[PDB]
Amino acid sequence: TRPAHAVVLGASMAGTLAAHVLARHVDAVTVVERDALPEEPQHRKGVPQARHAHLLWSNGARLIEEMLPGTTDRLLAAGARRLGFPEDLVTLTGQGWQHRFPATQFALVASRPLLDLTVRQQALGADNITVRQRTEAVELTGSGGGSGGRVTGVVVRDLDSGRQEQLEADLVIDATGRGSRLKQWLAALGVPALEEDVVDAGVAYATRLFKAPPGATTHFPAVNIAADDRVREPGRFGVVYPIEGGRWLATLSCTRGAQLPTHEDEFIPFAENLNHPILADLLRDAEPLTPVFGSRSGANRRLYPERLEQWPDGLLVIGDSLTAFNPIYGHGMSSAARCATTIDREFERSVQARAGTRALQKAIGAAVDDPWILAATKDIDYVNCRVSATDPRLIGVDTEQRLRFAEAITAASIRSPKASEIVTDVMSLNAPQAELGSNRFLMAMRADERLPELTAPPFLPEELAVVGLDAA
Amino acid sequence: TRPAHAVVLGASMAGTLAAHVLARHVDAVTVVERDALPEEPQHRKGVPQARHAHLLWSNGARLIEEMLPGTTDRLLAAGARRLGFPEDLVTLTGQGWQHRFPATQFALVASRPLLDLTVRQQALGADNITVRQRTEAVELTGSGGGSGGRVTGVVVRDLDSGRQEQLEADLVIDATGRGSRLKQWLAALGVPALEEDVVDAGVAYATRLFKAPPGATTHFPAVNIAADDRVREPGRFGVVYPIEGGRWLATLSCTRGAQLPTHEDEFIPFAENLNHPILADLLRDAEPLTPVFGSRSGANRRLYPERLEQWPDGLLVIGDSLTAFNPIYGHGMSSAARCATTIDREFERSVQARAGTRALQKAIGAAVDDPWILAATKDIDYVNCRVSATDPRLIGVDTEQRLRFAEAITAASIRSPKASEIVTDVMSLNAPQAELGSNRFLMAMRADERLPELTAPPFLPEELAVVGLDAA
Numbered sequence: 030t031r032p033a034h035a036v037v038l039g040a041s042m043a044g045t046l047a048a049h050v051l052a053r054h055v056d057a058v059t060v061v062e063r064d065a066l067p068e069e070p071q072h073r074k075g076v077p078q079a080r081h082a083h084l085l086w087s088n089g090a091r092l093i094e095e096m097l098p099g100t101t102d103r104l105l106a107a108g109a110r111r112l113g114f115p116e117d118l119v120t121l122t123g124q125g126w127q128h129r130f131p132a133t134q135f136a137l138v139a140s141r142p143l144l145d146l147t148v149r150q151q152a153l154g155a156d157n158i159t160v161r162q163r164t165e166a167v168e169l170t171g172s173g174g175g176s177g178g179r180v181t182g183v184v185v186r187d188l189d190s191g192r193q194e195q196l197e198a199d200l201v202i203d204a205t206g207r208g209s210r211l212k213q214w215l216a217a218l219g220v221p222a223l224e225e226d227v228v229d230a231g232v233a234y235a236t237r238l239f240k241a242p243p244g245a246t247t248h249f250p251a252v253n254i255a256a257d258d259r260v261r262e263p264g265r266f267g268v269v270y271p272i273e274g275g276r277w278l279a280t281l282s283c284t285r286g287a288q289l290p291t292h293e294d295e296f297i298p299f300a301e302n303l304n305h306p307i308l309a310d311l312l313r314d315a316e317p318l319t320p321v322f323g324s325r326s327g328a329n330r331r332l333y334p335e336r337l338e339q340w341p342d343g344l345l346v347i348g349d350s351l352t353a354f355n356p357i358y359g360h361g362m363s364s365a366a367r368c369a370t371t372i373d374r375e376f377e378r379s380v381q382a383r384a385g386t387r388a389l390q391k392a393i394g395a396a397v398d399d400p401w402i403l404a405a406t407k408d409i410d411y412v413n414c415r416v417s418a419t420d421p422r423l424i425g426v427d428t429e430q431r432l433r434f435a436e437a438i439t440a441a442s443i444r445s446p447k448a449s450e451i452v453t454d455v456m457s458l459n460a461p462q463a464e465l466g467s468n469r470f471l472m473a474m475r476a477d478e479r480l481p482e483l484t485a486p487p488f489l490p491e492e493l494a495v496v497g498l499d500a501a
Numbered sequence: 502t503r504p505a506h507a508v509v510l511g512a513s514m515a516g517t518l519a520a521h522v523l524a525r526h527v528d529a530v531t532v533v534e535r536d537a538l539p540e541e542p543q544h545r546k547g548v549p550q551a552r553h554a555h556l557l558w559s560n561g562a563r564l565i566e567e568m569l570p571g572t573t574d575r576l577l578a579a580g581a582r583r584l585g586f587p588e589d590l591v592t593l594t595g596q597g598w599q600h601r602f603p604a605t606q607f608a609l610v611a612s613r614p615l616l617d618l619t620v621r622q623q624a625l626g627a628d629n630i631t632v633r634q635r636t637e638a639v640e641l642t643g644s645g646g647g648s649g650g651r652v653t654g655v656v657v658r659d660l661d662s663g664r665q666e667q668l669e670a671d672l673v674i675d676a677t678g679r680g681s682r683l684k685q686w687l688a689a690l691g692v693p694a695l696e697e698d699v700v701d702a703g704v705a706y707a708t709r710l711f712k713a714p715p716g717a718t719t720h721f722p723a724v725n726i727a728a729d730d731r732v733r734e735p736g737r738f739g740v741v742y743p744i745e746g747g748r749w750l751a752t753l754s755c756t757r758g759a760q761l762p763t764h765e766d767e768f769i770p771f772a773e774n775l776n777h778p779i780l781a782d783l784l785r786d787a788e789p790l791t792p793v794f795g796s797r798s799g800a801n802r803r804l805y806p807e808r809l810e811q812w813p814d815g816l817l818v819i820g821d822s823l824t825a826f827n828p829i830y831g832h833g834m835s836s837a838a839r840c841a842t843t844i845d846r847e848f849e850r851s852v853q854a855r856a857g858t859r860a861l862q863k864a865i866g867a868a869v870d871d872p873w874i875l876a877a878t879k880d881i882d883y884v885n886c887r888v889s890a891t892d893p894r895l896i897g898v899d900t901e902q903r904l905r906f907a908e909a910i911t912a913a914s915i916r917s918p919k920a921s922e923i924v925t926d927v928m929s930l931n932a933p934q935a936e937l938g939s940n941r942f943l944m945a946m947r948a949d950e951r952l953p954e955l956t957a958p959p960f961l962p963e964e965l966a967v968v969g970l971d972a973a
């Protein structure tokens with residue numbers, strides 16, 4: 030019969046959205062969150078990635094807006110900014126500067142804790158959602174492997190008390206992020222291991238918060254230095270996004286074989302050694318507000334529970350636990366919104382053999398293919414890249430043809446409007462990566478006008494005035 | 502690599518939309534249509550159903566509008582009407598008259614040949630679609646059976662000539678309607694027979710065109726008379742929709758075990774023996790413009806090429822040939838729009854070893870599940886219904902439970918606004934039928950007000966003035 034009680038494990042983006050949606054179809058929804066959840070925008074041990082820059086692409090923004098009307102207006106009231114792509118950015122690519130064509134896509138930019146709090150507020154207010162903060166999921170109960178295994182509940186442990194308790198449920202949602210022990214829990218229940226694709230370029234991040242020159246959060250574009258020669262050299266990148274409170278979030282990145290700034294005095298010299306020193310120039314005399322924060326969670330890994338015949342009934346895995354991506358492309362939250370979107374849209378059809386949770390998990394798997402195959406294609410050809418994947422779209426490919434086509438796509442997007450719009454659709458997770466091989470894109474790539482090469486970064490004079498620069 | 506030439510077999514609703522969509526992804530697209538296609542709105546031997554009432558539910562209309570912008574305005578320019586449900590209809594159900602709540606869904610109503618021509622106009626004009634009229638596809642070429650056979654092309658026969666040239670293609674789409682020889686073509690090439698669910702209530706139709714009282718096509722609602730019972734007696738129904746040209750399209754229907762008006766003189770007496778004589782009264786002094794047209798195509802059929810592992814590469818089946826429904830629910834065209842919509846949205850992702858066509862056919866099959874189980878559930882329990890199906894949602898269900906819930910839904914839909922909106926979402930193919938078992942709907946069914954039972958059909962006095970009637 031219908032599920033009556035659902036336990037969502039984890040209360041970050043994936044868990045929160047899935048819990049809000051399940052509450053519409055399930056009588057009772059418990060959320061099990063290890064951390065205490067602040068009622069003020071504040072960092073916390075469970076989401077350490079929140080220290081680094083976070084783009085909410087249009088896909089995620091529009092999907093969240095549909096689940097939770099008013100969330101965008103609430104975020105912008107709080108000082109968030111809607112960056113239009115490519116209009117509101119100064120971007121250096123491997124092929125040159127991006128012409129700031131009129132915005133055809135957008136991302137919402139803000140400190141991640143502000144976005145998390147604003148979503149929790151809109152989503153977890155429901156009467157039939159009980160969130161148990163300071164509570165840790167320890168393992169899953171039930172049988173597994175063979176014939177017809179199912180998950181019956183979850184053993185949770187109060188952290189402030191230390192007591193343990195078995196929490197029974199008809200449905201269990203693992204949303205415990207990239208560091209999920211699902212594999213451990215599954216081995217405990219006697220479930221055979223899952224298929225796992227991995228494309229790991231060894232990306233790491235180093236981030237500092239800065240106080241921005243007055244007005245730069247609204248009248249100065251974001252600046253991104255994303256040039257790369259993947260097969261010869263490890264990548265080195267840098268970004269400066271505006272966030273709320275007149276602040277600049279500056280995030281530097283590299284791939285395996287390169288070295289990030291460990292100390293504060295090494296931050297600027299890394300931005301100086303990029304293909305253009307604009308970032309070092311912008312941050313030279315900005316006031317630093319934090320030390321350097323680091324992250325090493327940059328690998329593209331994807332589990333395939335939809336392929337496991339022994340997948341236990343009543344168990345779903347969403348978010349970073351199901352599949353996590355190279356954050357340079359900023360799709361983690363959008364694909365979290367996708368998983369909750371999919372649960373909302375296939376739940377009723379799936380509960381009418383409990384082939385309904387394996388149907389849910391199958392629809393969920395399809396929903397996250399777009400960010401997986403985008404990040405895996407871009408990263409697969411880096412020098413030193415660790416690759417362990419069965420995806421035929423990656424393994425049996427003529428690599429030099431792949432990079433020649435990669436350079437063509439970038440060369441078209443930076444200097445031709447029709448080719449730029451399609452790329453932003455893919456970059457904003459609103460169109461599949463395969464659209465860039467479509468005849469439509471091939472004809473835009475060939476027939477559209479190509480503006481001249483920008484010799485200097487395309488800043489408006491006003492914009493250089495806001496930060497006290499001119500010339501290049 | 503990508504397919505280069507696609508042959509769409511059939512140029513009705515399914516074929517035309519698929520041809521327009523394939524043309525966006527395929528360099529060359531030929532459509533093979535048996536009939537000659539008129540440039541003026543006219544009936545034709547290939548679409549004999551066009552004589553009978555045709556509702557374009559909101560689902561189909563919005564899908565067509567997105568693929569072919571401007572089609573809605575063109576239809577209404579031609580005199581079509583957008584019926585708002587339930588506001589613009591006078592409907593008798595098994596549980597009483599439907600309260601004309603403000604419209605929460607809509608259908609486009611017009612003569613089917615008018616809809617056919619204006620969609621062909623918007624769709625087949627493309628540079629890379631050549632339509633060869635008066636040409637019949639007779640059988641398929643290629644390999645087949647065992648491992649992974651493929652279809653190489655189609656043997657076509659020029660009709661005005663007697664000629665018989667083979668037309669090769671990378672992809673072939675069977676859109677030849679309910680009376681397609683697909684099964685013959687597949688058996689000849691050695692592919693095993695496909696799974697087929699059928700729930701056939703023996704539905705037949707009898708239709709007459711009438712000239713409507715001046716203004717009634719704009720200021721008088723559609724009138725729908727739907728019989729109550731199913732388990733004791735065959736159903737007897739009638740509807741009168743306004744169509745373009747100040748005309749009334751009147752279509753009467755019954756299920757197996759009843760007798761339809763076969764000739765002209767028993768039309769009125771059949772609408773006279775319905776549970777309310779409003780239909781016979783409305784056409785008593787109207788001018789009949791046609792003789793009575795008949796149809797016996799009322800069976801719910803669903804093929805499962807997504808289930809056949811021996812399904813030939815490069816072959817797709819869409820439209821009525823893939824799955825056909827009891828037209829009382831008016832979803833055939835909406836499910837055609839879905840099939841081309843699904844092709845358009847997963848073509849690029851799937852042809853990227855033709856493991857892509859079997860993915861397309863799986864995506865298409867999912868798109869047509871909603872009308873299938875929306876047409877099979879209502880019909881499954883009719884007297885005399887012949888059923889041969891593997892669908893667990895029909896075979897393993899408590900008959901009295903299905904019936905008890907059916908009347909509860911209708912009793913709620915006719916007298917409660919919140920319950921009415923959800924039902925119209927489902928009936929207009931905008932929500933899966935499983936939504937009517939949702940917690941959302943169950944609490945709408947229980948918490949929303951129930952207006953008093955309507956004693957008389959709910960015509961406004963103004964409306965009866967337009968047609969010269971009064972009383973009940």
Ligand SMILES: Cc1cc2nc3c(=O)[nH]c(=O)nc-3n(C[C@H](O)[C@H](O)[C@H](O)COP(=O)(O)OP(=O)(O)OC[C@H]3O[C@@H](n4cnc5c(N)ncnc54)[C@H](O)[C@@H]3O)c2cc1C
Nearest residue numbers: 039041043063075078083084166206348349356359361362
């Ligand atoms: C450096 C970096 C930059 C990123 N930038 C972007 C970006 O620009 N845009 C974007 O869209 N995405 C970005 N991402 C990805 C994004 O942060 C995640 O995809 C997003 O947070 C969704 O993760 P999640 O909800 O699945 O789990 P997480 O966000 O990782 O959270 C897991 C939650 O589960 C809880 N939990 C864990 N274990 C247990 C347990 N045993 N019991 C109870 N609770 C538990 C944790 O406390 C936490 O609250 C970035 C990621 C990184 C690392």
Ligand SMILES: Cc1cc2nc3c(=O)[nH]c(=O)nc-3n(C[C@H](O)[C@H](O)[C@H](O)COP(=O)(O)OP(=O)(O)OC[C@H]3O[C@@H](n4cnc5c(N)ncnc54)[C@H](O)[C@@H]3O)c2cc1C
Nearest residue numbers: 511513514515535547555556638678820821828831833834
């Ligand atoms: C009585 C009745 C009422 C209906 N009412 C509604 C309604 O209210 N709403 C709704 O949405 N749907 C309704 N339908 C269904 C709707 O008519 C169809 O679903 C719709 O026309 C889509 O069909 P199709 O394009 O797949 O094939 P069809 O419309 O049946 O057309 C098949 C085409 O293929 C061609 N063809 C066939 N064989 C060959 C061959 N060997 N070689 C070449 N060409 C060939 C034919 O000439 C024709 O052009 C109704 C159907 C019937 C029978």
Ligand SMILES: CC(=O)OC/C=C(\C)CC[C@@H]1O[C@@]1(C)CC[C@H]1OC1(C)C
Nearest residue numbers: 114115118120122127435436438439442
């Ligand atoms: C980096 C490379 O060659 O990999 C292939 C590139 C692909 C598949 C598309 C990515 C776009 O080329 C990028 C990186 C430029 C877009 C940015 O200008 C923005 C701000 C819209």
Ligand SMILES: [Cl-]
Nearest residue numbers: 077078324326
């Ligand atoms: Cl991190």
